[PDB]
């Protein structure tokens, strides 16, 4: 059903995986998925905006600036191996509403 635990992913692209990066130490924030392309690799890997990159190419993206993480990404040409961070449950359900009728 629903679950949320660490896990790595793999992308296939010379660089333009379709996803971007935003934040960093220089930014004063964690590395998150800036944007993504229509049904892009990242998307194909079920990557939503806000996903935090725990690692980049097996490297720790803890003490790495935006440029850094970007540098690594640039390093990767074949595939991109990075880890994401889970956050609570990733599923929402909208309840249906209805009203009675007058006689």
Swiss-Prot record:
Taxonomically, which superkingdom? Eukaryota
Residues annotated with N6-succinyllysine modification: 92
Residues bearing PTM N6-acetyllysine: 92
- Covalent link Glycyl lysine isopeptide (Lys-Gly) (interchain with G-Cter in SUMO2), residues: 92
Domain PDZ positions: 8-88
Q: Where in the cell is it found?
A: Postsynaptic density; Presynapse; Postsynapse; Cytoplasm, Cytosol
* Subunit field text: Interacts with various PKC isoforms through the LIM domains. Interacts with actin and alpha-actinin through the PDZ domain. Interacts (via LIM domains) with SIPA1L1/SPAR; this interaction may occur preferentially with isoform 1.
The protein's job, in short, is:
May play an important role in the heart development by scaffolding PKC to the Z-disk region. May play a role in the regulation of cardiomyocyte expansion. Isoforms lacking the LIM domains may negatively modulate the scaffolding activity of isoform 1. Overexpression promotes the development of heart hypertrophy. Contributes to the regulation of dendritic spine morphogenesis in neurons. May be required to restrain postsynaptic growth of excitatory synapses. Isoform 1, but not isoform 2, expression favors spine thinning and elongation.
Could you tell me what this protein is called? PDZ and LIM domain protein 5
What species does this protein belong to? Mus musculus
- Taxonomic lineage from the root: Eukaryota, Metazoa, Chordata, Craniata, Vertebrata
